């Protein structure tokens, strides 16, 4: 071929070379969503009946 | 034929080869609404009247 036959698709642009994806840049705010959501599985679960 | 006859309908594109399907995908959202749905069965079934 020449070269290193390989071309990489860079998902955001930087000059401080971070190869930042979606997923682990939104980490704590899906983790956020599920702990709200365990809290009221676990409200509704122990606490939702007189 | 020249080939194995069989062509693969995949559902979801993925390099990491993750066949993956709509309803193992969605498998706790659904079991989430009929735990809340049971919930409620039970409410209305021993704590619904004075």
């Known amino acids: ?5 390989f071309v990489r698709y860079v998902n955001m642009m930087d000059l401080d070379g ?3 994806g979606e997923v682990e840049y939104l980490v704590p705010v ?5 702990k709200t959501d365990y809290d009221r599985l676990l409200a509704q679960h ?3 009946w007189k």
């Open 18 to 20: 971070f190869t930042m």
């Open 46 to 48: 122990y606490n939702s």
């Open 30 to 34: 899906a983790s956020k969503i599920d």
């Open 1 to 5: 071929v020449g070269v290193c036959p």
